Amino acid sequence: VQLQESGGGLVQPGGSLRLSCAASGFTFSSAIMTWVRQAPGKGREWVSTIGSDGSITTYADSVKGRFTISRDNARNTLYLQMNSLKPEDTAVYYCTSAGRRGPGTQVTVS
């Protein structure tokens, strides 16, 4: 199990971003996948979960409507699409599975 997030950056409020999680070392297509974020000075916050076949998706209320979780099983990649970004989405986002995570990708919305 290895995981690598990318896609973060500095974006303006109301902006938009696509995060990516490339996964290796296990059969991604069989794995429940989850995004968590860690805002500065706050507790870790669950963002969104996606069942292995990608038809079940769940979201935090704080992102319901703006964020979209998605996966491309053929390419061992997980996605988070983020619209109407706001300053309180400033966080490190972590792709996570079976108690493992990647190094994270920071998102800064000034």
Next chain:
Amino acid sequence: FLAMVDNLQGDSGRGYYLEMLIGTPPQKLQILVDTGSSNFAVAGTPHSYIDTYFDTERSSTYRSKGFDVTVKYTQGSWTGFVGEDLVTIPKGFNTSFLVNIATIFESENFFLPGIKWNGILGLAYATLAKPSSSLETFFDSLVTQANIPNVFSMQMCGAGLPVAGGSLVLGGIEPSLYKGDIWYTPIKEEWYYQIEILKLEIGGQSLNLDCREYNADKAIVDSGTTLLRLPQKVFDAVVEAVARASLDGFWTGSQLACWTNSETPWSYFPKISIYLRDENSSRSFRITILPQLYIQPMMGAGLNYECYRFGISPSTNALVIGATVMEGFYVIFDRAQKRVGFAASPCAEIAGAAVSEISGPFSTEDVASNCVP
């Protein structure tokens, strides 16, 4: 956490169980709590010793993973389809969560007569999950989707009860469930909750044994095992030490031993103490169980006598700290910090007497640097 106090039903003899709602619309199930395994599995067919099963066809949010898993135990196995579904824990969480789940369609010696549960919750580490460590454990799912710390604690309140409830706190420690200090011992390996046993004492008296015998293969904390289990060689030492301190297929669990109620058998037996290395390796703490915990009543009040079972059985591979010992303590599975905590359970009393004790620090000058082979 307060919503999770008394969220368990059951007793040591039969196991402790949590109530769960699974799928859309929900199917209620009674789930055994097992810190000795890592899978979430439920009955998937009718079976002779369960009232109820999970029907994956009756759940709109169920999704098959397209494979099955077999899990072998020491005695008893099952094979189940693997799916994902949304689960709710009514006594603890208002929100529902997406977990992996195995639906048993073939078992052997698993659902036994007189059992109340129809599923098991594996609370051990990812490395023990089947078919591989890649099948996200139920608690790993819970940590991530519920925003709770990587910690759970457990209290059983079944001491004194006839063999023939409690609390599982998901995400921390409920201070109303203990008094005194929590003693923490490191987790040596993350698969089972493996910890390091330094010494066993039977009535203030050390066994002659080398400290490695206690960790022969491993010393674990497992809620899904009923008795205190000991490696065959250690078991023989304990029986002979207990026997030469008290007055038979009793020791080996072929016969019970009976007394009339006037005979108060609980004083004739010694206390058993297990010493554990503290986070500071130069000191140890001691968890002690009285006779009331290991000389176990069978029938309960009603007759003018009682029959008793010996709560310690032999084992080949592990030293298993089961319910026989867990009934005495509030046990904190502090995954986040790689340690297991113990405090005395206020509820571990009979006739107003505590049936367990905790104390320390004791020096470890005596014992080897590492008792784990």
